[PDB]
PDB file of C-alpha atoms in Angstrom:
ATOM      1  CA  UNK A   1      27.004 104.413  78.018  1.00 28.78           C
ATOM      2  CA  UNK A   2      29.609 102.071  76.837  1.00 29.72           C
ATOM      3  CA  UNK A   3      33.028 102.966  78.555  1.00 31.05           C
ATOM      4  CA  UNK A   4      36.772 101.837  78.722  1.00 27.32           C
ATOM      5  CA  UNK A   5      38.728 102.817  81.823  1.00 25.73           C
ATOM      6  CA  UNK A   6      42.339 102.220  81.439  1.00 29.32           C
ATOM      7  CA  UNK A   7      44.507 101.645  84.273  1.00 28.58           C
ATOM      8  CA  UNK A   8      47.127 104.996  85.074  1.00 32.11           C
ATOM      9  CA  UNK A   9      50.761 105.471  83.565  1.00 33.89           C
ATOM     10  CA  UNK A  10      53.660 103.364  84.041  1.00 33.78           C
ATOM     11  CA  UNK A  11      57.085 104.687  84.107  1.00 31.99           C
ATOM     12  CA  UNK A  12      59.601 101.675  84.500  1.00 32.39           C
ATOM     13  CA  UNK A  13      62.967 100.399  84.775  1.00 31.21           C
ATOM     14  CA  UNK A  14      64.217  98.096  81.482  1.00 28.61           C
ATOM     15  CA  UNK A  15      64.024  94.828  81.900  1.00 29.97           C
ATOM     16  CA  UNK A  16      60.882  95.143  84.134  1.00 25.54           C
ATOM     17  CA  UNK A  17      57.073  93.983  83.300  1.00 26.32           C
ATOM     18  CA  UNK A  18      53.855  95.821  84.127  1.00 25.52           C
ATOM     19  CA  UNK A  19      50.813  94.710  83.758  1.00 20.95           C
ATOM     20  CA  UNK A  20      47.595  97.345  82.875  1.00 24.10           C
ATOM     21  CA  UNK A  21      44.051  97.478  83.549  1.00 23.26           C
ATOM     22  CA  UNK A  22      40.697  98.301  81.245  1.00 19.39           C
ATOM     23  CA  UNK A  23      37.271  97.959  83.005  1.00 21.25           C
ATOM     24  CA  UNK A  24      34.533  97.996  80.790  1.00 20.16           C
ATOM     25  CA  UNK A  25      31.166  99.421  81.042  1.00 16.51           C
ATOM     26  CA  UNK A  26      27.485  99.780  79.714  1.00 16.19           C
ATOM     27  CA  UNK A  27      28.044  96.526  77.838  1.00 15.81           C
ATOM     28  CA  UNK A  28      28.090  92.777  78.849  1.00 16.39           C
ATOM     29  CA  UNK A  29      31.389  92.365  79.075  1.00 18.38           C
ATOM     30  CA  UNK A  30      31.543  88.297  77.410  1.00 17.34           C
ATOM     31  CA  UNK A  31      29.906  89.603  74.134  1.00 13.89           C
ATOM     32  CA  UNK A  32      32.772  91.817  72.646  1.00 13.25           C
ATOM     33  CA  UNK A  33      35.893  90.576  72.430  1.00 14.47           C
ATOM     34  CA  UNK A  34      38.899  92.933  74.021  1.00 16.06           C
ATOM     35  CA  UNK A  35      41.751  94.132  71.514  1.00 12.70           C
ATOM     36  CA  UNK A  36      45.250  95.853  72.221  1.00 16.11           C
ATOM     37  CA  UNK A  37      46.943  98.486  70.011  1.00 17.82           C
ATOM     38  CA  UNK A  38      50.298  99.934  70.582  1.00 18.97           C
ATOM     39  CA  UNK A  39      51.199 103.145  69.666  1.00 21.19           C
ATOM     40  CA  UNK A  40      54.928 104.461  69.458  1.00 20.93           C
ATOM     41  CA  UNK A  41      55.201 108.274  70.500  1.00 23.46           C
ATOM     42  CA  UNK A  42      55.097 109.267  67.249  1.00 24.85           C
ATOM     43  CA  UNK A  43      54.272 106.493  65.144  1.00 26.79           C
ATOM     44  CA  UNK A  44      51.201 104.260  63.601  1.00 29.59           C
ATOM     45  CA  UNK A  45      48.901 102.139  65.253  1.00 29.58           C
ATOM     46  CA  UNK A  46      49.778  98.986  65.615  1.00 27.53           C
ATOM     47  CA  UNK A  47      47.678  95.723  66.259  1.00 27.45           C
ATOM     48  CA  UNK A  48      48.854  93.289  69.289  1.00 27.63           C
ATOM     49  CA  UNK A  49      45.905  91.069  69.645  1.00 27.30           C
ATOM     50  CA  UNK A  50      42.467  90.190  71.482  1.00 28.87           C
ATOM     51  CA  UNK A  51      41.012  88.642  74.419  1.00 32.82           C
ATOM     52  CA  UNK A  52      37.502  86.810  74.429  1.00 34.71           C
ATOM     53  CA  UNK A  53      36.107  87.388  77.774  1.00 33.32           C
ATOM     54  CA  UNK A  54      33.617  84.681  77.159  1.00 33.83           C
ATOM     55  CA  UNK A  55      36.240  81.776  76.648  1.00 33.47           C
ATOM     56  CA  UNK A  56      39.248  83.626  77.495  1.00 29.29           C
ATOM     57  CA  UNK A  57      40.520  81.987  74.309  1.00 27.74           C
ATOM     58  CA  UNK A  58      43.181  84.674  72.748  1.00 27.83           C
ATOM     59  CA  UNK A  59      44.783  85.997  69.253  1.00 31.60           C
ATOM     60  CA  UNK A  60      48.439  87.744  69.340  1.00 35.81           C
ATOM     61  CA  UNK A  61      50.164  88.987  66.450  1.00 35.63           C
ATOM     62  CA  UNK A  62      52.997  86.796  65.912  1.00 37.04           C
ATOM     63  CA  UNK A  63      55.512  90.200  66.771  1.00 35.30           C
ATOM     64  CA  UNK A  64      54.237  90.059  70.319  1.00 35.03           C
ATOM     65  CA  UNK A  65      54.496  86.998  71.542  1.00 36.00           C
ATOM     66  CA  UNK A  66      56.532  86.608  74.580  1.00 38.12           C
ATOM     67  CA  UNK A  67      55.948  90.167  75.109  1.00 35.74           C
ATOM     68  CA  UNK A  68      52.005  91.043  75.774  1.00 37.07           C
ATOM     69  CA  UNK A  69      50.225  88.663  77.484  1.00 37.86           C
ATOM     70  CA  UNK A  70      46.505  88.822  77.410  1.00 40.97           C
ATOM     71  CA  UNK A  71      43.945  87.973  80.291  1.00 44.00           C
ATOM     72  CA  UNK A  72      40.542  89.068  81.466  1.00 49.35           C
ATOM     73  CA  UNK A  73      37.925  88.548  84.389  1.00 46.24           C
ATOM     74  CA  UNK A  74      34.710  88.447  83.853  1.00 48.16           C
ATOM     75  CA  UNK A  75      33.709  89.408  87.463  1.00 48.71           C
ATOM     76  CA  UNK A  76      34.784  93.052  87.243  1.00 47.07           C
ATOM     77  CA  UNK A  77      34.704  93.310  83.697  1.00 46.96           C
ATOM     78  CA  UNK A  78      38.057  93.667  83.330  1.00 48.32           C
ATOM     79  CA  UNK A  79      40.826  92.831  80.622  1.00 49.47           C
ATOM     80  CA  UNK A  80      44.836  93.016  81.542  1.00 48.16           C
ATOM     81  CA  UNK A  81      47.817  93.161  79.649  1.00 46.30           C
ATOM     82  CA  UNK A  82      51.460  92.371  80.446  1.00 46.05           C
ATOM     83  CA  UNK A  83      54.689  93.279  79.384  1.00 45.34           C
ATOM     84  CA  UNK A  84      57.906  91.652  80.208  1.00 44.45           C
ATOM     85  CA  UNK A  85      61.185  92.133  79.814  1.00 45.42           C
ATOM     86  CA  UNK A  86      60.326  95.900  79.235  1.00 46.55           C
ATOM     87  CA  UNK A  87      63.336  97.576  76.687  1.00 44.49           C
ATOM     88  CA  UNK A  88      63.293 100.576  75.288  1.00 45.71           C
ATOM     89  CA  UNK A  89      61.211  99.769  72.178  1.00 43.65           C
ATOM     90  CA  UNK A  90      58.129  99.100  74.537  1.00 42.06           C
ATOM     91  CA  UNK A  91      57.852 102.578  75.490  1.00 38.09           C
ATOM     92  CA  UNK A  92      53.954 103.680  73.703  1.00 40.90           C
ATOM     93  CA  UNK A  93      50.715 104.475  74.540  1.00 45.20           C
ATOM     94  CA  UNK A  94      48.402 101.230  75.043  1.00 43.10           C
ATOM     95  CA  UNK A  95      44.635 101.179  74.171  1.00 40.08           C
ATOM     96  CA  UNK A  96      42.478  98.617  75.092  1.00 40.93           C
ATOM     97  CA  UNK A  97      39.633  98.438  72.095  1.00 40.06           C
ATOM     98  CA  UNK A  98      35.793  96.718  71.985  1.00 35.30           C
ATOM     99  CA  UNK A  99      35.627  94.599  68.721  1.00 37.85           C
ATOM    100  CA  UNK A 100      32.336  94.084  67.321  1.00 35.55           C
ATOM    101  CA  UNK A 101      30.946  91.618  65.306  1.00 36.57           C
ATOM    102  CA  UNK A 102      28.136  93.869  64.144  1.00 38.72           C
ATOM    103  CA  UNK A 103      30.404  96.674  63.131  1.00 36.75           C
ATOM    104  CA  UNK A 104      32.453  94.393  60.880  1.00 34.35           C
ATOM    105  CA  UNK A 105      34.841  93.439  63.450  1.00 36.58           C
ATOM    106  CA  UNK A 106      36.204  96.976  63.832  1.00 37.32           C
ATOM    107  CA  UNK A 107      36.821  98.631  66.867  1.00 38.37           C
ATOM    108  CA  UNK A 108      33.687 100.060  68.462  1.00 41.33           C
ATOM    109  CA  UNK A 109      35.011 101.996  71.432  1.00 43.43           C
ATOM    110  CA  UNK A 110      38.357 102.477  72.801  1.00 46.33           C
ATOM    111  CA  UNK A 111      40.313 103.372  75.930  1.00 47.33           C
ATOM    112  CA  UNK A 112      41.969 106.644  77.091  1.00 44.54           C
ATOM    113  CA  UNK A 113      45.440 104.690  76.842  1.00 41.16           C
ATOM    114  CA  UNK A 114      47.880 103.895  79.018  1.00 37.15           C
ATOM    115  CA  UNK A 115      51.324 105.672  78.788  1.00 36.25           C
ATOM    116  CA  UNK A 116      54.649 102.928  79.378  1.00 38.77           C
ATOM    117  CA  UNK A 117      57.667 104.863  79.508  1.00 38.21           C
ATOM    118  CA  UNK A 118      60.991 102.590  79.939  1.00 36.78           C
ATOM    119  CA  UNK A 119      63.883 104.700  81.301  1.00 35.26           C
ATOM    120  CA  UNK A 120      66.861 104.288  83.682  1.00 36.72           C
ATOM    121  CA  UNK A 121      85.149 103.794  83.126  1.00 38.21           C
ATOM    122  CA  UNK A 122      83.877 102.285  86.222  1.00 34.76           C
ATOM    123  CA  UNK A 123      86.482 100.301  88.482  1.00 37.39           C
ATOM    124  CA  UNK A 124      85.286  97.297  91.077  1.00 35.45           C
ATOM    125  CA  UNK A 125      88.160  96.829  93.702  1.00 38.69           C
ATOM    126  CA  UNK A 126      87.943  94.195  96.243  1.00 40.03           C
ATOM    127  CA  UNK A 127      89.393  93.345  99.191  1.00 40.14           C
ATOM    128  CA  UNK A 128      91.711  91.330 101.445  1.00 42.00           C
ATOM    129  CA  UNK A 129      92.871  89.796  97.633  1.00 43.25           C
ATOM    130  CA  UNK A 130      92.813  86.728 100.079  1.00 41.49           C
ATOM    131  CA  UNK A 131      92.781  85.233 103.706  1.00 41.06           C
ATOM    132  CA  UNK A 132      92.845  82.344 105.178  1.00 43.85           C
ATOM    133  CA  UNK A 133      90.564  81.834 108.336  1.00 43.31           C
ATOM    134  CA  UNK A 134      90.026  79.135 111.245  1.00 48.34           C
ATOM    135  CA  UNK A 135      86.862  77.346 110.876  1.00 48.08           C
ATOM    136  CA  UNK A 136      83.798  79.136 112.787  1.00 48.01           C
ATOM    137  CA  UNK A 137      85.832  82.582 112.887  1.00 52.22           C
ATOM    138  CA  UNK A 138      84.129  85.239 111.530  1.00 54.22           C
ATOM    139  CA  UNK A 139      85.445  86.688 107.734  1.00 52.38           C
ATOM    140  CA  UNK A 140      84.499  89.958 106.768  1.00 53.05           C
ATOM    141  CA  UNK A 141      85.201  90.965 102.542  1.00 55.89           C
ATOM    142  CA  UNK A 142      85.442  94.147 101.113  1.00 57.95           C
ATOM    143  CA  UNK A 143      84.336  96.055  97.667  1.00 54.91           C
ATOM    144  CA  UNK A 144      84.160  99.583  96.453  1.00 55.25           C
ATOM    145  CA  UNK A 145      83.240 101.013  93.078  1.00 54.70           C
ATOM    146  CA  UNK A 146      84.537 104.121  91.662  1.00 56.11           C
ATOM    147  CA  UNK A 147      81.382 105.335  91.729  1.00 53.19           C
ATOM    148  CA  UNK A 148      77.969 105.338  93.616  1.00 51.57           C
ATOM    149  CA  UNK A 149      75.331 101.853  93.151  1.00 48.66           C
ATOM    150  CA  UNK A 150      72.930 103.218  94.754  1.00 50.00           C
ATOM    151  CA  UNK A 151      70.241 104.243  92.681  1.00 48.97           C
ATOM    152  CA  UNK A 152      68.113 107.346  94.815  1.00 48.13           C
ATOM    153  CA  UNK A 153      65.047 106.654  92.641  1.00 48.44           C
ATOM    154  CA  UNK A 154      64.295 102.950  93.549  1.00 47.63           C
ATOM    155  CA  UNK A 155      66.866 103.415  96.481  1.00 48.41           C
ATOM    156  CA  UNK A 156      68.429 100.151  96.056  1.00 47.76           C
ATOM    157  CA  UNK A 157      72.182  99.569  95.834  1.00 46.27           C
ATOM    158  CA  UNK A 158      72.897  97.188  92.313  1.00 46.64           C
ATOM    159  CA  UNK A 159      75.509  95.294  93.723  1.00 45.23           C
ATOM    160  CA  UNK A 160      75.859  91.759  93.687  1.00 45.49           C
ATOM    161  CA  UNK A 161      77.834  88.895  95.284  1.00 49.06           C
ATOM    162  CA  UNK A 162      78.869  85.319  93.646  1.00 47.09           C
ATOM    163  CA  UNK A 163      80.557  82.430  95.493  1.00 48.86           C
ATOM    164  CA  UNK A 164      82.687  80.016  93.553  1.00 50.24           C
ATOM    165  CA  UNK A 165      83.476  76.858  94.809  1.00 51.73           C
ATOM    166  CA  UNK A 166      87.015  74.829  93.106  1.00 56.57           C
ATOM    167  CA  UNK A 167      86.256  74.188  89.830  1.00 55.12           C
ATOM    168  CA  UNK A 168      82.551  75.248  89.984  1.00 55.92           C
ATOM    169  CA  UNK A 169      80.159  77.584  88.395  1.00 51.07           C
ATOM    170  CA  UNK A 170      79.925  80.619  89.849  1.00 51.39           C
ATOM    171  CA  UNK A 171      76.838  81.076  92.715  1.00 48.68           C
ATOM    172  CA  UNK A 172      74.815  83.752  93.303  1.00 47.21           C
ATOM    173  CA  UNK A 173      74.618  84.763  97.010  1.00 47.88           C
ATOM    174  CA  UNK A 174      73.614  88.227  97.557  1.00 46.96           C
ATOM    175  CA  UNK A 175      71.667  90.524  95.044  1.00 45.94           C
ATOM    176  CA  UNK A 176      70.701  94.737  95.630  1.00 50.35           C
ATOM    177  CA  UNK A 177      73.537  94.447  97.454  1.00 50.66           C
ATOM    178  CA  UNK A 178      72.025  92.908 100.935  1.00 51.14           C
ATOM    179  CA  UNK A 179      69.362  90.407  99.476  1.00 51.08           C
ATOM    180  CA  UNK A 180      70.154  86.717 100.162  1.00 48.64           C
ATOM    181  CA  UNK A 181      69.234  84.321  97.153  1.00 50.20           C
ATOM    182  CA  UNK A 182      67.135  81.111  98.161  1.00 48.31           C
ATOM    183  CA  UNK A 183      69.401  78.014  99.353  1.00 48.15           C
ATOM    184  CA  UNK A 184      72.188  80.308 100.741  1.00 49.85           C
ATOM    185  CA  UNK A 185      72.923  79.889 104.340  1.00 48.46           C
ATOM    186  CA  UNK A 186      71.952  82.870 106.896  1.00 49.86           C
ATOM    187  CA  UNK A 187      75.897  83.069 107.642  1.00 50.20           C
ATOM    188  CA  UNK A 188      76.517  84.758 104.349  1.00 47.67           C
ATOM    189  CA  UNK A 189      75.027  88.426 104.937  1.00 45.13           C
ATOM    190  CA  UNK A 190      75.994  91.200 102.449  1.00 47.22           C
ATOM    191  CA  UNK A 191      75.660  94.856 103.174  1.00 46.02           C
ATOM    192  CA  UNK A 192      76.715  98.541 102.664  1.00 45.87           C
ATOM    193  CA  UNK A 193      75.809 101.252 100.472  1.00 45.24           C
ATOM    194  CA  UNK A 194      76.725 104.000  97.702  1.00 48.68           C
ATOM    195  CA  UNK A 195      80.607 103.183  96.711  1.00 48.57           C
ATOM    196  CA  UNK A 196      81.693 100.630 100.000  1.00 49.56           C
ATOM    197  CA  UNK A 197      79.891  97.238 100.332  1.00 46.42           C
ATOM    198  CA  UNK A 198      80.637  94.313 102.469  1.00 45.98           C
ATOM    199  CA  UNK A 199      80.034  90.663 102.483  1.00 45.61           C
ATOM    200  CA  UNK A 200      80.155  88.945 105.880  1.00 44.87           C
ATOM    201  CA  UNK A 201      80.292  84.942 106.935  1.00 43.87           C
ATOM    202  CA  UNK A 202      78.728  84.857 110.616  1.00 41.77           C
ATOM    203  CA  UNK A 203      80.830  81.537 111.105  1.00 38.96           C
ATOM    204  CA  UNK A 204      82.851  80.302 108.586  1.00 33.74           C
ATOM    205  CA  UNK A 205      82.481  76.391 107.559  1.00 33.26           C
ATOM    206  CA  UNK A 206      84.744  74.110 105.495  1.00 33.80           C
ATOM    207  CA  UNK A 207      82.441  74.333 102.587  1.00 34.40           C
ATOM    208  CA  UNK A 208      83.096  78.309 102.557  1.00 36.79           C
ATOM    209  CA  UNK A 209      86.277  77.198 100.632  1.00 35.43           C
ATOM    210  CA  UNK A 210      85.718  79.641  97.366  1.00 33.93           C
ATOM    211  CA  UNK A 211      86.879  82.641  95.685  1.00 34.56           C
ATOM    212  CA  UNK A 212      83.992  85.665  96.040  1.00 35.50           C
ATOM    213  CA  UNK A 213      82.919  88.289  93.256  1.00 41.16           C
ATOM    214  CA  UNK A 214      81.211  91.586  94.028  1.00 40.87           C
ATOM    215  CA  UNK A 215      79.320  92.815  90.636  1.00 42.48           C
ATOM    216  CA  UNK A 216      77.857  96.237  89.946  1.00 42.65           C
ATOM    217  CA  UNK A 217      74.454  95.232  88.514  1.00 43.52           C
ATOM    218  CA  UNK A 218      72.884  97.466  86.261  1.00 44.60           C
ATOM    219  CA  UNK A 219      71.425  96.469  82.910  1.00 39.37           C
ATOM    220  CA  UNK A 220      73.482  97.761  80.230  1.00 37.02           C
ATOM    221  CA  UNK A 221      76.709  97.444  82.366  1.00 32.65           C
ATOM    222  CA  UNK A 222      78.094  94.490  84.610  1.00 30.93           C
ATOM    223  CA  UNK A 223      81.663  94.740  86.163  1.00 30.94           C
ATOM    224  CA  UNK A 224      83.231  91.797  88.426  1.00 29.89           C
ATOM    225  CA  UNK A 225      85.406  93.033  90.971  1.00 30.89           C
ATOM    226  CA  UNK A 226      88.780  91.289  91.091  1.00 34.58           C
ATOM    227  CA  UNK A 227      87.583  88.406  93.979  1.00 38.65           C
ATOM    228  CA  UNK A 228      88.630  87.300  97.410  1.00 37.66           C
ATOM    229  CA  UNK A 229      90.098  84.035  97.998  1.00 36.25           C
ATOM    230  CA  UNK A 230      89.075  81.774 100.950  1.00 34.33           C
ATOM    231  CA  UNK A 231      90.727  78.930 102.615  1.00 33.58           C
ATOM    232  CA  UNK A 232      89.620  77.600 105.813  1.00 33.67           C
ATOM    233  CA  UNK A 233      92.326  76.436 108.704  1.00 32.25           C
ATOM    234  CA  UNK A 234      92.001  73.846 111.524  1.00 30.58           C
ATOM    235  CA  UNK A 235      90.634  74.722 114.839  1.00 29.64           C
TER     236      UNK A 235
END
């Protein structure tokens, strides 16, 4: 009667967070608590904490906090966990486990599991080294890596653009190569794919005065390409 149904398997890029499922069943849902247990490959279990569906009140063990984050709903019987900032350590098999008071606080009945696997020199050149341009023209920037961004599994190119302004912090513009970051003009428009990517200014303003880095984005490895300089003339 009793039943723990845990969400499917999760196979994930590092740095990401997922978030899985247990719906319980054949027991009122508020009057167990909900517990979490990790379990590396080949290793031990190991405790991460609870859930009381009742007050939604929650116990971690110290080790996971600000990694699992515990949550339930009592309207579909239902307890969550999330992971952030997945690395390579978070890779195990997660059970979602009834506690019971009347068995000694032990765990009653658990779930199936769900499996959370977290798996996946180089030379940035960049182009015109600089160039100066009459305001409103058009500028068009170069950048090529030695070797393929583009990532065929999420199909998404991990390039990035920064602007930076004299004696200023660098600014991130574009991200996955044609994604515009919030509070950056529509004029700035990045694009290309595999190993040639280009950053374009629809019509270039006085403020455009900056020096712009391409980066090949990739946790693990970062790489700046050398920069294009940008001075704006009269007209």
């Amino acid at each position: 009667e009793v039943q723990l149904q845990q969400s499917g398997p999760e196979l994930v890029k590092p740095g990401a967070s997922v978030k899985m499922s247990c719906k319980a069943s054949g027991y009122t849902f508020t009057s167990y608590v909900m517990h979490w247990v990790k379990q590396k490959p080949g290793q031990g279990l190991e405790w991460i904490g609870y859930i009381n569906p009742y007050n939604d009140g929650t116990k971690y063990n110290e080790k996971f906090k600000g990694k699992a984050t515990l949550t339930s709903d009592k309207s579909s019987s239902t307890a969550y966990m999330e992971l952030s900032s997945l690395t390579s350590e978070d890779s195990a098999v997660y059970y979602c486990a009834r506690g019971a008071y009347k068995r000694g606080y032990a765990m009653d009945y658990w779930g199936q599991g769900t499996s959370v696997t977290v798996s996946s020199d180089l030379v940035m050149s960049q182009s015109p080294s600089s160039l100066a341009v009459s305001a409103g023209e058009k500028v068009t920037m170069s950048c090529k890596s030695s070797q393929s961004l583009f990532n065929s599994r999420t199909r998404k190119n991990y390039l990035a653009w920064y602007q930076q302004k004299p004696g200023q912090s660098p600014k991130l513009l574009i991200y996955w190569a044609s994604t515009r970051e919030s509070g950056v003009p529509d004029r700035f428009t990045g694009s290309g794919s595999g190993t040639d990517f280009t950053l374009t200014i629809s019509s270039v303003q006085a403020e455009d005065l900056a020096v712009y880095y391409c980066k090949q984005s990739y946790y693990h490895m970062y790489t700046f390409g050398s920069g294009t300089k940008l001075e704006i003339k009269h007209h």
